[PDB]
Tab-separated table of N, CA, C and O in Angstrom:
chain	number	residue	atom	x	y	z
A	1	UNK	N	116.554	106.241	88.982
A	1	UNK	CA	115.875	106.470	90.251
A	1	UNK	C	116.537	105.677	91.374
A	1	UNK	O	117.378	104.813	91.125
A	2	UNK	N	116.153	105.977	92.611
A	2	UNK	CA	116.720	105.285	93.753
A	2	UNK	C	115.879	104.102	94.189
A	2	UNK	O	115.971	103.654	95.332
A	3	UNK	N	115.056	103.595	93.278
A	3	UNK	CA	114.206	102.462	93.594
A	3	UNK	C	115.000	101.218	93.937
A	3	UNK	O	114.475	100.284	94.542
A	4	UNK	N	116.271	101.204	93.548
A	4	UNK	CA	117.140	100.063	93.815
A	4	UNK	C	118.090	100.363	94.971
A	4	UNK	O	119.244	99.935	94.966
A	5	UNK	N	117.596	101.101	95.959
A	5	UNK	CA	118.400	101.458	97.122
A	5	UNK	C	117.664	101.125	98.416
A	5	UNK	O	116.683	101.780	98.769
A	6	UNK	N	118.145	100.106	99.119
A	6	UNK	CA	117.532	99.687	100.374
A	6	UNK	C	117.473	100.846	101.365
A	6	UNK	O	116.706	100.815	102.328
A	7	UNK	N	118.288	101.867	101.121
A	7	UNK	CA	118.328	103.036	101.991
A	7	UNK	C	116.922	103.456	102.404
A	7	UNK	O	116.679	103.791	103.564
A	8	UNK	N	115.998	103.435	101.449
A	8	UNK	CA	114.615	103.815	101.714
A	8	UNK	C	113.685	102.612	101.574
A	8	UNK	O	112.795	102.406	102.399
A	9	UNK	N	113.898	101.824	100.526
A	9	UNK	CA	113.079	100.644	100.278
A	9	UNK	C	113.950	99.405	100.098
A	9	UNK	O	114.479	98.859	101.067
A	10	UNK	N	114.094	98.964	98.853
A	10	UNK	CA	114.900	97.788	98.547
A	10	UNK	C	115.681	97.986	97.251
A	10	UNK	O	115.241	98.701	96.351
A	11	UNK	N	116.844	97.349	97.165
A	11	UNK	CA	117.688	97.454	95.980
A	11	UNK	C	117.138	96.607	94.837
A	11	UNK	O	117.827	95.733	94.312
A	12	UNK	N	115.892	96.875	94.456
A	12	UNK	CA	115.250	96.140	93.373
A	12	UNK	C	115.811	96.555	92.018
A	12	UNK	O	116.951	96.238	91.682
A	13	UNK	N	115.000	97.269	91.243
A	13	UNK	CA	115.433	97.717	89.931
A	13	UNK	C	115.370	99.225	89.786
A	13	UNK	O	116.398	99.883	89.622
A	14	UNK	N	114.160	99.773	89.842
A	14	UNK	CA	113.968	101.212	89.710
A	14	UNK	C	114.904	101.974	90.644
A	14	UNK	O	115.219	103.140	90.407
């Protein structure tokens, strides 16, 4: 998933 992309949120893990 893009959960780890600051593009929308933050470059966490998911």
